[PDB]
């Protein structure tokens, strides 16, 4: 009983073999029979070695969303989408199309020009910060409270230029 090898899953005392990618579960293995698995339709796919009974349907890249098909989806692999040309894929999951990425708060920019379709972001260096998501802006240096004021808390990358004050 228990433990169970990788590529096995265990159920009601028996150590059963998982279904290979591209095949769905139909019957749990017994003491005498191996796990009954069956393939997916070329609509459906299955990611991993599983005990899932329903195959997942393929992605679907809608051109009216700027998506095109990169890799054709197989019985063991989902359809991999890609964005048009002048645009990049809004995420790792090629789900939506953006003209270009936007460099989230703690980062600056190094610009987009395609097919270099993204904007190449830099983590803010020491003494610099960036608030807001911006497609063009760079990190900016902290304001020197010093000018008839005293620094009360500090900034750094995300946080707004050292808040303050006063004291001196």
């Amino acid at each position: 009983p228990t433990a169970c090898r990788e590529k096995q899953y265990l159920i009601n005392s028996q150590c059963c073999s998982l279904c290979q990618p591209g095949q769905k579960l139909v019957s749990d293995c017994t003491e005498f029979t191996e796990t009954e698995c069956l393939p997916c339709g070329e609509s459906e796919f299955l990611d991993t070695w599983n005990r899932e009974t329903h195959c997942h349907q393929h992605k679907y890249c809608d051109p009216n969303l700027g998506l095109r098909v990169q890799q054709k989806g197989t019985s063991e692999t989902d359809t991999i989408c890609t964005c048009e040309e002048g645009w990049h894929c809004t995420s790792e999951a090629c789900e939506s199309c953006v003209l270009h990425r936007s460099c989230s708060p703690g980062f600056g920019v190094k610009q987009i020009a395609t097919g270099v379709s993204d904007t190449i972001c830099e983590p803010c260096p020491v003494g610099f910060f960036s608030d807001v998501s911006s497609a063009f802006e760079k990190c900016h240096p902290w304001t020197s409270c010093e000018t008839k004021d005293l620094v009360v808390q500090q900034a750094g990358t995300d946080k707004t230029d050292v808040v303050c004050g006063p004291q001196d």
């Epitope: 009216n64 809004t90 953006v98 270009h100 936007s102 807001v132 497609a135 063009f136 802006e137």
Partner: nanobody, 117 residues
């Protein structure tokens, strides 16, 4: 898709000419979003022209248009602008205005710019 951007003030102009593109925005807090101007032409295929921050403090310009073109905005009028002066043949294109995510909803209908002689 409730975001609506309306391009205005395009046209044919002789080299050295001037034109002021107007992108009348509606359906979102315009005052909060960073904006862009992009041009598309057959062959010259898509070029990011200019960018402006929500406030109007910061702007970005492609080297090609620098000093001739000028991005601007009136947040109280909710309109985006492009003062394109000292115009050249290369600028002949269909110009579009953005909205920060930069998805399909986020785009203006475009306006055409042509120079000739």
């Amino acid at each position: 898709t409730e975001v609506q951007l309306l391009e205005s003030g395009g046209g044919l102009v002789q080299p050295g000419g001037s034109l002021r593109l107007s992108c009348a925005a509606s359906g979102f807090t315009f005052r909060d979003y960073e904006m862009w101007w992009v041009r598309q032409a057959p062959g010259k295929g898509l070029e990011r022209v200019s960018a402006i921050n929500p406030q109007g403090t910061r702007t970005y310009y492609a080297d090609s248009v620098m000093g001739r073109f000028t991005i601007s905005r009136d947040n109280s009028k909710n309109t985006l602008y492009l003062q394109m002066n000292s115009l050249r043949a290369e600028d002949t294109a269909v110009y579009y205005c953005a909205k920060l995510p930069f998805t399909f909803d986020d785009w203006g209908q475009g306006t055409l710019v042509t120079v000739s002689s």
